Amino acid sequence: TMRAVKRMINTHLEHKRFALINSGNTNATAGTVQNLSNGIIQGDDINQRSGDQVRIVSHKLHVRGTAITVSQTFRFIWFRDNMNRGTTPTVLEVLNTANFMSQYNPITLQQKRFTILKDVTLNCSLTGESIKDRIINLPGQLVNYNGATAVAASNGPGAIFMLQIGDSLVGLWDSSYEAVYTDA
Amino acid sequence: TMRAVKRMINTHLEHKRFALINSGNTNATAGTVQNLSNGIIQGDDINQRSGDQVRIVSHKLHVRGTAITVSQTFRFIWFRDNMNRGTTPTVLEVLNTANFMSQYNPITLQQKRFTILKDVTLNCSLTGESIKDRIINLPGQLVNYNGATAVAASNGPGAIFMLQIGDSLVGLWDSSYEAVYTDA
Amino acid sequence: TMRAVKRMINTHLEHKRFALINSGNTNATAGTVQNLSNGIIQGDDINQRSGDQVRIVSHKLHVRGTAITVSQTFRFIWFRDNMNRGTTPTVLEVLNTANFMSQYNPITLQQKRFTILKDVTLNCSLTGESIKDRIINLPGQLVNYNGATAVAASNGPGAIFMLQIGDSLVGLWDSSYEAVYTDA
Amino acid sequence: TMRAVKRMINTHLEHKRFALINSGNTNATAGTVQNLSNGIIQGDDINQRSGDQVRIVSHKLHVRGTAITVSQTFRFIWFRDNMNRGTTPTVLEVLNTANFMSQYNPITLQQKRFTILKDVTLNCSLTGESIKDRIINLPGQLVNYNGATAVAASNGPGAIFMLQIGDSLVGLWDSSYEAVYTDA
Amino acid sequence: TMRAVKRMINTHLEHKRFALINSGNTNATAGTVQNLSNGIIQGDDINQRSGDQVRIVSHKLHVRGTAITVSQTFRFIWFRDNMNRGTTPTVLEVLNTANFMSQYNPITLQQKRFTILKDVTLNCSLTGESIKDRIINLPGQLVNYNGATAVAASNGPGAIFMLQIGDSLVGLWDSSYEAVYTDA
Amino acid sequence: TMRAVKRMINTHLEHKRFALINSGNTNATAGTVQNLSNGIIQGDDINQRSGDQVRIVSHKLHVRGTAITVSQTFRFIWFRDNMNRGTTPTVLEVLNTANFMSQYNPITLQQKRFTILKDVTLNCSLTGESIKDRIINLPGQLVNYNGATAVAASNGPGAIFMLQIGDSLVGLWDSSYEAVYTDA
Amino acid sequence: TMRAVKRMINTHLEHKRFALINSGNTNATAGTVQNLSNGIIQGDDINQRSGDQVRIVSHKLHVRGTAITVSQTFRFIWFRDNMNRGTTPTVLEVLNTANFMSQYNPITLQQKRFTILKDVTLNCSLTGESIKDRIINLPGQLVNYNGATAVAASNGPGAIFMLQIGDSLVGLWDSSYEAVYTDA
Amino acid sequence: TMRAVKRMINTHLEHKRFALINSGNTNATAGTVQNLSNGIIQGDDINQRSGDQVRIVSHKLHVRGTAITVSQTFRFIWFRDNMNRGTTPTVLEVLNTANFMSQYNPITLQQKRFTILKDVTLNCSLTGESIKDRIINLPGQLVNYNGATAVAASNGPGAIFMLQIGDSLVGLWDSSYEAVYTDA
Amino acid sequence: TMRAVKRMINTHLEHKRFALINSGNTNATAGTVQNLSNGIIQGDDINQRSGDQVRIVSHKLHVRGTAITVSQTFRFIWFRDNMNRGTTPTVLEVLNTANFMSQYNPITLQQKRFTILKDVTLNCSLTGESIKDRIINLPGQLVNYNGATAVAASNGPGAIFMLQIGDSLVGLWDSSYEAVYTDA
Amino acid sequence: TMRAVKRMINTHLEHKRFALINSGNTNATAGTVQNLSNGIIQGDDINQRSGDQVRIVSHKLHVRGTAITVSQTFRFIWFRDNMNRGTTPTVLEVLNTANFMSQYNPITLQQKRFTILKDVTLNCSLTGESIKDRIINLPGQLVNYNGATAVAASNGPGAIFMLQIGDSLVGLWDSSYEAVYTDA
Ligand SMILES: [Mg+2]
Ligand SMILES: [Mg+2]
Ligand SMILES: [Mg+2]
Ligand SMILES: [Mg+2]
Ligand SMILES: [Mg+2]
Ligand SMILES: [Mg+2]
Ligand SMILES: [Mg+2]
Ligand SMILES: [Mg+2]
Ligand SMILES: [Mg+2]
Ligand SMILES: [Mg+2]
Ligand SMILES: [Mg+2]
Ligand SMILES: [Mg+2]
Ligand SMILES: [Mg+2]
Ligand SMILES: [Mg+2]
């Protein structure tokens, strides 16, 4: 019976879509954290939200690494921040050490501060597959906001981030992100 | 049980209303296509939409023709464009020939490009009922948009149009349109 | 169960459509018989047939009379010829006498030579409703042909005709015809 | 019981087949959209249609990319246009931006203007697998047409297209397409 | 079971048809009674009877009045004489007074001398609908005869008549009558 | 139970009988069509009809060919015309070509214009059985007429004909026909 | 239930008919193979096909031999080629030796290359029945084609042929062939 | 259940075929016995056997007699020798006397030495049917051999023979024989 | 129960095996068709057949391509000819065009002339996996023959072939084939 | 019911986490054994234990090899020491010989001295994938200790080790280890 409720309710709720592209970035040893869900700002457009809450029905992540000069490994971490208070998470909050071989931070994952959605490691070789890509599609959850604009202060619980970290600074990595959500 | 769902859900969704008036237009031999649902633009007002989708619960069409100089026939076609891509439909896409006696286009109706809601023909005579009117009330369906403003490029699948065509160019026809819709 | 067969089969058969217009004709005392289904000719187009048989799912007739000079009556007979052998039926085969008040021919209707679909009589007055129209929509049956082109010799059993007869020779009557058929 | 209907009906309907080959084309940054189902024209031959509707039982897509000069990525999008009105779709209607990393257009996919059948990305490296191919076989649906010939104006709802877009202009990509359909 | 008897028996009995036309008659104040079923005479033709009895399966009456000079009312009475003895009924036997506003004769209708099938009153105005018509189709009953020819002496119980009476002597009224009967 | 109805009804209906003889006719290459049921004319005699309809309970055909000079083949076609309009059918309407080896006309038999009752081919040899005969007895159906006399214009749907065609013009063929029918 | 499917489907499919005549041919010792189903060519006519497949509902074969000079035997073989690749079968593929007394080829019938429908042998004597004929009516099966025209290259699996072989070269044999098929 | 065994086993066993022709032989008064099954010799070909046993699934006999000079009777006896020891049976072992009117030998048929499959007598007259033929198809049984080659010494139990005997020495008779057998 | 039949019967039937090797062949642009099942000839050896039929229980295909000079693609088509008449199939009968990217021939596959068992495409790169191989194991069906020796004329329905076609003429491809069959 | 116990108990027990990283080590021919679980020392911190027992709910192993100078194979053995007495296991206790191709020691695995969790072999080529990695996640068991500090003497039954051994001494391998355990 609950299935009928989903059909009945979701047929009356617009499934807004937001598209994000981030191409041309270099590989990092210390690492970087990239905002994906923050592009959803306040407004009456299809790629915007009313209020500070949106339910993401599903979202897609696409990454692609390229090897330059030397063979290198690209690591991508797709996680969810359930305790954000208006800040872009650092790398040391997600990993025990700032190394691509590092494991997740024991303190933060015990608290369930972050939820890992998918961790991807790409090895791109000059003498082999110099280019390597992967696509991930997963369901989403509720996403809160602490503001209106697309600045870090607008992030809230349920924020969406991607962590990139590797063994070289010369390779180039590209990514894209799309989300399907309801704003009611 | 599904009836309770409708009551439960529709009691929590605002039923926005949009009113449209179009009076003083002359009768046409070649014909004209008039936008009705495009007046719904983006915004936070009661006669506006958020996003690019709205479900029309019901809508009403009112037409009225007047005979001037000579007796003439007013034909009104109330149809739905389910394949709009940002254009106001022409008359030859709806009729085999640009004549008030013409039948619907076989190619487009086979594809279900247009859905006919109600076709009305009014005969107004100088020696008789010089004035003649009719009111139509029907349920609505989902209406998409390809933009934000009230220009033709904003029209999308589910658009609402009215086709007017007659045997004279001197008569005057007036119309009105109201829609009750939910924007969630 | 037979309902499912109709859905299963008709979803795989193209519903070809043919549109016919005939406007500007004068009213007749002796009467005239007009071909409607003969425009369907052999070919691979949407308004054509392969072979010499087509099943008409439904068809529509639209007529409109206008009074000129004097008040006059327009009579329209929409019948089906189930015994055609390559000829356009005459008026005396359909009516006992060549008069708009005449009844159907007793000899031919006993044989079921013709099947009456709808008989329409319009009275158009100069001091009243100078113009009068009517629309008829009915299901169709099998239609055979005795040729390929759009000449009278191509007509066969199941042909579609309209008989027009009135009390004056000055009035003008217009008509249109559309058919939805399967050619398999 | 409905299974028997499929066997009973499909044993009496010819399964026409159409073969298409497109080889020697260069990789594109802005992208290109290729017609596949338009080669089916009107006629009485096995690779032709009668009317403007055909049901595609199944269809197959074959692609193959080759790396020249530099390593490059080939992206292939196999989609269905359900709202075509006589035009070859552009790339910006299918992607948010004209980039191989771009996501699908939020506005058009919300409307269900296009249906994605299969998206394929091939990475061809000079130091590795310089050549890479893939074969896709899927069931088909109804395909309408707006004309008779093999020009873009003949395309209609259900049209079949392939989008090719990459990160270089020197690589060469080849493709083939076959469809099995019934024309009744 | 009795339904099968009707099908079994009526499939073996010829359904003879008789057509009658009476056009160009003037409106009457005192009134006139017109013979309709008397045209059925003795013979071996399709519009004739053997003996003096026929069962009328169904019969149709068509009337049409026209206004001349002044606006006038046409009254038509379609009745059945169940006690005829070889005479054409008068108007005073059917109406209390020889006036178009008169009610049926109390003495004769108490006896069931006449059976009223349909009473029609047409108001034709020079400034409005100068012409007005009506068609009636009803089942029939047994019809006896007192002779062989088409004279009044041949009428018997079950005879069919029409009474015409109005408020002017200048208008023209026309009529037609057809009957479907079995002669076994 | 329906069997009792047949006994009950047929015991009260006279079974009229009509006898026809046609002897001394020569064999034909182009062929000839002979009227058999037309001898039933209007009247009160036992071999006549009242009206224009008769139900033939059963009918019998007898043919006999004789060889003269050279051996020859006699072909006899006993068919029923269900779409007659007052004409004696030609040979080209029944056969694709005017040859004794010809097959039935594809166009007319698709329409069911003619119903084949029995086709008989007799080969008569001078050195063998110079004479050869055959008798056929079949049930009948309803037979309509378009007139009263025994001319071709009196033929109607359900008419009865025999087609004779052979490979020589010197042989002599004889025939007879009897029908048992009810005229009620 | 499957019977209803046949009625439901076959009532919507035209039963095209093709008529073939072949008269005046001499008897053969070595034998000859005659094309019967190849006359069905591509087109939109009633005696034509769309595509390269047709289902033959039923087909009829008529043969007739005549004795000239000396008494001779006519042998007729009506077979089906289920493995045709664009060639008219030879006589040695159907018979072990080129003799009218020969049996079927063991190699080809083991493979089921040919399917025998009916084998007819006629003995025509000058001192007896100089002429002898036979008619065969059988159901049909699917018939494929490898082309469009009526040449041998157009023949495919399911082709229809007749083999004629006898003990003399002076006799004359005639034949005809008709087929009832659906082209959907 | 045993039916399934036949299908299961016979689908895995080759059905070898052997064709035999014997034409141009004269009619005999004393009679002659002809070998039919002996042509099956040892080898790996389709018309050969491995070992000395074969099961004949079915076999066919075709005979044809011709009258020369005087009218004569051809008698054909198709029998089976179940006790053969390497000899071609004589005529006196099959008939009480060497006469075409003779009955079967009482001594040998009591022992079931021979099994009669079909006895055919043809009367061919110069003034009538000078030629007469007959075809017989029957199931077969096990056939043993006493050798390898096609000589009489190779015959064994189950051998197949035909006895020909008549009242004249001038007529010519022809025959053919085919067998379908399994060699496992 | 039918499973026991398979065990019971197959335990008494020898499972003959045939081994085929074909190494050192160059890649082809136009393509080549290779005989695999023809090596089975007549005889009493384990790799031979008696008669002209064998049931292949299972068969195995092994292919291996090598890149020389330039990177190239090897395409292998493993199909079954069900309508062979003593010929090695050409490439144009299996493919619409003589290109490695070509699709299967629509005309021949509609007829089911060929049955595709497995299509394999190998891409061999000089900078990567210069060598690439694949092994296929499938069940078999009945295989007929039209001769005795290992020439093309000996091929029959059920023949086994492999089609090789590529984009270069310098690469070398090798293959092997083994079949397990019963000859009873 | 036991499932509820797990939920009830594990919700009250802290799931301590320990993170270990070991990067920059060279490949070994003789091999090396690395301590992973010994980093868990006594204390009140989250990455420490109270007592000498901890239950590991789950643990993760990550390895990554890199090829330098020459292509080489990295072998990783992830095992459990269930009989430790305060010593780091040697390589000869785990393998029959100190070779990367060696099998496990028969004597020690019979005793179940070591339990193999996962054995991974990575082949890294200079002309191909110079870098190769793998991630393993498995449940854990009880882990005892014989001390307090992170020296080898502190190891006890249930210890966790990784064995690395390869065919070269120039390659570099990196690893990480994380464990989730309860200390109650
Ligand atoms: Mg919201
Ligand atoms: Mg909305
Ligand atoms: Mg048709
Ligand atoms: Mg490489
Ligand atoms: Mg079609
Ligand atoms: Mg009567
Ligand atoms: Mg009379
Ligand atoms: Mg009658
Ligand atoms: Mg055509
Ligand atoms: Mg077809
Ligand atoms: Mg044997
Ligand atoms: Mg041998
Ligand atoms: Mg065999
Ligand atoms: Mg503890």
UniProtKB/Swiss-Prot annotation, chains A, B, C, D, E, F, G, H, I, J:
- Origin superkingdom: Viruses
Specify which residues bind Ca(2+) 1 according to the UniProt entry for this protein: 14, 44, 50, 53, 127, 183
Binding positions for Ca(2+) 2 per the UniProt entry: 14, 44, 127
Q: Entry's InterPro entries?
A: Satellite_CP-like (IPR005597), Satellite_virus_coat (IPR010392), Satellite_virus_coat_sf (IPR037164), Viral_coat (IPR029053)
Cofactor detail note: Binds 3 Ca(2+) ions per subunit.
Location in or out of the cell: Virion
Q: Which UniProt keywords apply?
A: Calcium, Capsid protein, Metal-binding, RNA-binding, Virion
Coarse class of the protein's main subcellular location: virion
Chain positions recorded as Ca(2+) 3 binding sites: 14, 44, 127
Q: Which GO terms describe its cellular component?
A: viral capsid
GO MF terms on file? metal ion binding; RNA binding; structural molecule activity
**A Pfam family matched by this chain, by name?**
TNV_CP
Q: Among its keywords, does the record have Zinc?
A: no
Task: Tell me which cofactor or cofactors this protein depends on.
Answer: Ca(2+)
Which function does this protein serve? Answer: Self-assembles to form an icosahedral capsid of 17 nm in diameter.
By what name is this protein known? Capsid protein
Query: What does UniProt list as this organism's lineage?
Result: Viruses, Riboviria, Albetovirus, Tobacco albetovirus 1
